[PDB]
Amino acid sequence: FRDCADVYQAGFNKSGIYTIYINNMPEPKKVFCNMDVNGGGWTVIQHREDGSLDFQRGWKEYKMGFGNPSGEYWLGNEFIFAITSQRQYMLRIELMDWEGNRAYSQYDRFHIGNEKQNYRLYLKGHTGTAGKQSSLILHGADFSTKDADNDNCMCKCALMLTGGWWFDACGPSNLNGMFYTAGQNHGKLNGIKWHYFKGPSYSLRSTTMMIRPLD
Amino acid sequence: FRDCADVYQAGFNKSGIYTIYINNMPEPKKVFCNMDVNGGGWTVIQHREDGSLDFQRGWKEYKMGFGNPSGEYWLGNEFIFAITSQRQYMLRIELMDWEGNRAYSQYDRFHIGNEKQNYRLYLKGHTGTAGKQSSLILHGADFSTKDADNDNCMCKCALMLTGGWWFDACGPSNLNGMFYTAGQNHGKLNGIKWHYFKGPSYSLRSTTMMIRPLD
Ligand SMILES: [Ca+2]
Ligand SMILES: [Ca+2]
Numbered sequence: 110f111r112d113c114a115d116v117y118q119a120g121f122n123k124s125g126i127y128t129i130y131i132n133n134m135p136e137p138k139k140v141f142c143n144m145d146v147n148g149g150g151w152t153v154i155q156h157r158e159d160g161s162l163d164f165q166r167g168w169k170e171y172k173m174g175f176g177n178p179s180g181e182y183w184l185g186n187e188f189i190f191a192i193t194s195q196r197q198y199m200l201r202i203e204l205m206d207w208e209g210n211r212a213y214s215q216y217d218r219f220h221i222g223n224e225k226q227n228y229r230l231y232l233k234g235h236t237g238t239a240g241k242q243s244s245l246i247l248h249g250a251d252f253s254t255k256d257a258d259n260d261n262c263m264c265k266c267a268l269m270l271t272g273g274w275w276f277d278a279c280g281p282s283n284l285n286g287m288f289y290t291a292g293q294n295h296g297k298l299n300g301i302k303w304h305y306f307k308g309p310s311y312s313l314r315s316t317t318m319m320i321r322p323l324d
Numbered sequence: 325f326r327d328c329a330d331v332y333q334a335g336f337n338k339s340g341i342y343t344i345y346i347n348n349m350p351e352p353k354k355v356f357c358n359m360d361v362n363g364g365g366w367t368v369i370q371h372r373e374d375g376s377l378d379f380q381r382g383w384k385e386y387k388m389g390f391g392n393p394s395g396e397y398w399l400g401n402e403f404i405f406a407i408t409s410q411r412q413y414m415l416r417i418e419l420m421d422w423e424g425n426r427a428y429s430q431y432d433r434f435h436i437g438n439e440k441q442n443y444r445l446y447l448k449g450h451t452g453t454a455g456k457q458s459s460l461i462l463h464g465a466d467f468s469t470k471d472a473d474n475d476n477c478m479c480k481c482a483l484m485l486t487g488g489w490w491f492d493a494c495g496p497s498n499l500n501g502m503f504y505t506a507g508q509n510h511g512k513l514n515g516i517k518w519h520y521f522k523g524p525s526y527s528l529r530s531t532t533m534m535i536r537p538l539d
Contacts, residue, residue, distance in 0.1 A: 196440050218444075218464055222435060225411055229433075231446040233464035248462070249433055249448035 111195050113142035114150035114322050122149065126178045131191045138188060141178045143319050151201065151319035152192065154184040157301065158315040160288030164272045168257040171273035172224065183273075183285070186221065186228040186252060189320075193220040196322050200232065202284070203317040204239050204303055207293040212239035212306050216247075219320060227251035227259045230275040240305025244282040250275040270299045281305060284316045326410050328357035329365035329536050337364065341393045346406045353403060356393045358534050366416065366534035367407065369399040372516065373530045375503030379487045383472040386488035387439065398488075398500070401436065401443040401467060404535075408435040411537050415447065417499070418532040419454050419518055422508040427454035427521050431462075434535060442466035442474045445490040455520020459497040465490040485514045496520060499531045 110116060116127050124144045128137045129152070143151040157164075162181035174185025192198070200219035205211045217234030229251045235243035251259035253266055254273040260266040266276035272285030281304035289300045292312035300312025307313065325331060331342050339359045343352045344367070358366040372379075377396035389400025407413070415434035420426045432449030444466045450458035466474035468481055469488040475481045481491035487500030496519035504515050507527030515527025522528065 194438060194440070197442075220437060220441065220444075223409060225409070226435060227412075229435075231464065249446065 112150075112192055112320075112322065113140065113144070113152040116142055117144055117150035124149075131188065132195050134188065134191050138184075139178045140184060141182075143317070146201065146203065146319075150321045152184075152321065153178070153182075153317055153319045154189050155182065155284065155316065155318040157181045157284070157288060157317075160290065164285045164288075166254065166273060168254045168273075171252065171254050172228075187224065190221055190223055190228060193320065198320045198322055200318065200320050202237075202239065202245075202303075203315075203319070204306055204313055205315045206307055206311065207314045213237045214239040214243060214245070214303070214306075216243075216245075217323075221252070227253075227257070239303060242281075242305050244303040244305045246275060246277045246280050250277050250280065281309075284313075284318065287312070327365075327407055327535075327537065328355065328359070328367040331357055332359055332365040339364075346403065347410050349403065349406050353399075354393045355399060356397075358532070361416065361418065361534075365536045367399075367536065368393070368397075368532055368534045369404050370397065370499065370531065370533040372396045372499070372503060375505065379500045379503075381469065381488060383469045383488075386467065386469050387443075402439065405436055405438055405443060408535065413535045413537055415533065415535050417452075417454065417460075417518075418530075418534070419521060419528055420530045421522055421526065422529045428452045429454040429458060429460070429518070429521075431458070431460075432538075436467070442468075442472070443490075454518060457496075457520050459518040459520045461490060461492045461495050465492050465495065496524070499528075499533065502527070 110130050122144050127142045128139050130137050141153040162176045172187045174183055176182025198219050200216040202214045214237040216232045219232055222229040232247040253259045253276045255267045258265050260276040262278035266279035270283050271287050274283045274285050283302050286301045287299050289312040325345050337359050342357045343354050345352050356368040377391045387402045389398055391397030413434050415431040417429045429452040431447045434447055437444040447462040468474045468491045470482045473480050475491040477493035481494035485498050485501050489498045489500050498517050501516045502514050504527040
């Protein structure tokens with residue numbers, strides 16, 4: 110049982126917390142499994158909805174993960190890497206604004222490099238209702254944090270926008286930015302953003318990043 | 325000593341065959357080291373000059389490598405993956421036609437996925453004198469061979485063009501195609517090609533693919 114896809118095919122069709130056994134990882138891992146969207150079998154790698162969890166963290170916490178799979182959390186890059194190294198995964202991103210609208214972006218192929226490659230992101234095949242173009246750079250960006258300046262900018266994107274992300278310079282997204290209750294009509298530019306959906310100044314209400322095998 | 329870059333910095337400035345010790349590989353590996361081009365320190369992952377070596381091979385030979393580092397060879401995907409997983413590498417490709425002209429393409433970032441990811445290629449930052457656009461797909465293609473149909477085509481690119489490559493459908497290159505002596509004015513489309521340098525019907529005289537750390 111390497112992922113929520115496995116969990117699903119073994120007959121567990123209810124979304125919720127499961128434990129999975131990831132190849133090459135020393136200990137099992139608790140994750141949230143979304144079994145509802147588009148046939149289910151999704152492993153959630155990040156979730157936000159209320160701002161209870163602080164995302165202003167360093168490289169090591171972003172690597173190992175933080176938060177609680179039952180609420181807001183970040184799975185951790187080391188884990189995302191280990192899972193997406195086992196086979197070929199697709200990535201889906203669920204987004205909601207503060208006005209009741211839900212949208213998604215989806216990528217046919219997703220993986221990231223290992224820690225020595227700064228967990229560099231490579232994607233292909235963007236579709237969805239959250240913008241005609243991808244708000245995540247497809248073409249290559251390392252992961253960056255306040256203590257690891259790996260972006261494609263002369264500036265320091267993590268310092269400017271907060272959180273850990275595959276910043277470009279700094280690029281059209283950051284789902285790990287500041288949670289703002291007043292996302293809609295008020296600031297700022299360091300919030301939870303997805304440019305091609307709601308723009309650079311709109312901070313979103315909830316996000317879920319989740320992955321599953323090509324099939 | 326993980327690569328020819330290490331070899332070079334230890335004072336070995338003469339191009340030729342060296343043995344390197346790649347992290348996570350059970351046995352040492354002989355490679356050709358190019359210490360001449362642009363400051364040296366290049367590890368050669370493929371070389372062709374005379375057509376003496378047959379490149380029409382299956383997945384396993386492409387994975388483990390074939391040929392002799394002193395002549396024409398393919399390092400092997402498992403090895404390319406192991407090396408490029410150690411640290412961030414750039415890729416440079418040296419090309420010569422049959423009319424005396426040499427050119428190169430260069431990529432700021434290079435790596436490939438693991439075997440379970442079909443050694444998928446991801447590149448960024450193409451420069452050089454071998455075409456204004458990259459003849460290798462940057463955006464994502466698995467590696468394909470006659471016995472592993474992983475390309476982005478409905479057709480079978482490896483069967484049509486021969487060899488093992490990151491075929492698209494089938495894309496603007498194949499440095500592992502048929503070696504033709506009569507490449508300039510004669511066939512064929514299944515030759516050693518780099519579209520943005522010489523075109524799809526021109527088979528090249530020599531090729532060298534080589535890698536080195538960003539520094
Ligand atoms: Ca920077
Ligand atoms: Ca095909």
